[PDB]
Amino acid sequence: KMAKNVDKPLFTATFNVQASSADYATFIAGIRNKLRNPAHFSHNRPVLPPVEPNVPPSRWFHVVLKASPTSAGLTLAIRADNIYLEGFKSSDGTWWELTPGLIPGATYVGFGGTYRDLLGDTDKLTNVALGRQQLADAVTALHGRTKADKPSGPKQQQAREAVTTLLLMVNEATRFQTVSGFVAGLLHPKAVAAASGKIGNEMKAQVNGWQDLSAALLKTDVKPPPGKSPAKFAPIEKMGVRTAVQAANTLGILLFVEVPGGLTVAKALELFHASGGK
Ligand SMILES: Nc1ncnc2[nH]cnc12
């Protein structure tokens, strides 16, 4: 304790909830691009820099979701090292937080940021509806939160539903091309009927095994010992991911993992800084 720089993002990505599917894809791609360690890719997918050892989380960026081109943002506070959502900012200026005492002068929303906290189990993910209206409503309900009012059970219930929706349509979208592609597939022009959708089991598993999938691809990059054949990608069948090429098409941006024979935390951060990363 406590978190550092929440007020000073390394960049801000902005999205208009009424904008085109292509603009959403551009929005997501830009986040991954700005998060990347320039010195570390795996199969031409970006890898996040390691989490800095011996300090509290000090690298953040903001995402702004807007009702319209001129509306003011619902601001999300997200870690630039593991893309964790920890805070959001309502219209009256109140930073709300998902971890007690994490963010400077923030107010604990009343519930945790984990899928078990928000839903009740990691396997309820395949029940959450996403889409343009779900996104807009989630943005509204959060941005409409005021520093005064009674955390009614009903109000909390709606709020957990909202965070679950945005985590999926922003955070998990940044992490996974499957998720981002799914969300982009839900976004249509006005001339198309409104649409909703829930992620399938492969994406649920992917979302629940980001570290595992990241680590699994990272192992294929390790150069092998003498006399042993080089490493083969090891399938995560529940994820529908059986090959390295499939893993690369699935990963939006990889979490940094220390794998045996791969980059260490110190070394990857060293390469990150040498390439101009901040
Ligand atoms: N609170 C949270 N923030 C970011 N990613 C998450 N994945 C699951 N829960 C999350």
Side-chain angles (χ1 to χ4, degrees), residues 90-109:
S90 52
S91 44
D92 58 340
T94 310
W95 278 104
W96 302 90
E97 63 175 344
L98 291 161
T99 307
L102 183 57
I103 301 175
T107 298
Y108 182 62
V109 80

Side-chain angles (χ1 to χ4, degrees), residues 71-184:
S71 153
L74 161 66
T75 302
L76 303 195
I78 306 167
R79 295 180 53 171
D81 49 18
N82 65 353
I83 320 169
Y84 258 76
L85 175 61
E86 285 298 339
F88 67 80
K89 182 171 178 174
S90 52
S91 44
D92 58 340
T94 310
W95 278 104
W96 302 90
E97 63 175 344
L98 291 161
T99 307
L102 183 57
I103 301 175
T107 298
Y108 182 62
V109 80
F111 53 80
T114 314
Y115 290 139
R116 59 189 184 260
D117 296 322
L118 300 166
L119 292 332
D121 186 285
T122 57
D123 62 18
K124 302 268 178 107
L125 281 173
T126 55
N127 120 98
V128 189
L130 309 176
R132 190 185 295 282
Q133 201 55 60
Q134 288 75 9
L135 173 64
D137 289 344
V139 170
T140 316
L142 235 79
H143 201 231
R145 203 176 177 82
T146 86
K147 191 195 247 211
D149 186 70
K150 348 155 201 194
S152 93
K155 255 171 201 183
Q156 293 291 103
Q157 178 51 265
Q158 180 192 57
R160 281 195 313 286
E161 301 204 87
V163 168
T164 305
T165 56
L166 301 187
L167 285 183
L168 283 164
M169 299 181 80
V170 174
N171 303 74
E172 307 299 351
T174 294
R175 290 158 175 160
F176 300 98
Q177 299 194 248
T178 47
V179 175
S180 68
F182 168 92
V183 170

Side-chain angles (χ1 to χ4, degrees), residues 126-271:
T126 55
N127 120 98
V128 189
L130 309 176
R132 190 185 295 282
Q133 201 55 60
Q134 288 75 9
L135 173 64
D137 289 344
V139 170
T140 316
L142 235 79
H143 201 231
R145 203 176 177 82
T146 86
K147 191 195 247 211
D149 186 70
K150 348 155 201 194
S152 93
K155 255 171 201 183
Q156 293 291 103
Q157 178 51 265
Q158 180 192 57
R160 281 195 313 286
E161 301 204 87
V163 168
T164 305
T165 56
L166 301 187
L167 285 183
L168 283 164
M169 299 181 80
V170 174
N171 303 74
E172 307 299 351
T174 294
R175 290 158 175 160
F176 300 98
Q177 299 194 248
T178 47
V179 175
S180 68
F182 168 92
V183 170
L186 281 160
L187 301 185
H188 307 286
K190 290 289 208 299
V192 177
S196 293
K198 293 157 265 121
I199 77 183
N201 284 341
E202 292 86 3
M203 278 186 283
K204 178 191 65 180
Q206 291 161 15
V207 168
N208 292 326
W210 183 39
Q211 184 161 208
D212 290 328
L213 185 55
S214 293
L217 191 58
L218 287 171
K219 292 172 184 188
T220 66
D221 296 326
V222 184
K223 263 91 174 189
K228 299 184 205 199
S229 58
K232 255 45 186 337
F233 181 81
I236 305 183
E237 192 64 38
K238 73 196 174 90
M239 281 179 182
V241 181
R242 291 184 185 161
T243 67
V245 166
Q246 286 172 12
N249 279 322
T250 301
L251 290 153
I253 178 169
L254 282 74
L255 182 63
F256 182 79
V257 187
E258 295 192 281
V259 302
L263 294 174
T264 59
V265 169
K267 180 61 170 298
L269 279 163
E270 171 177 313
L271 297 180

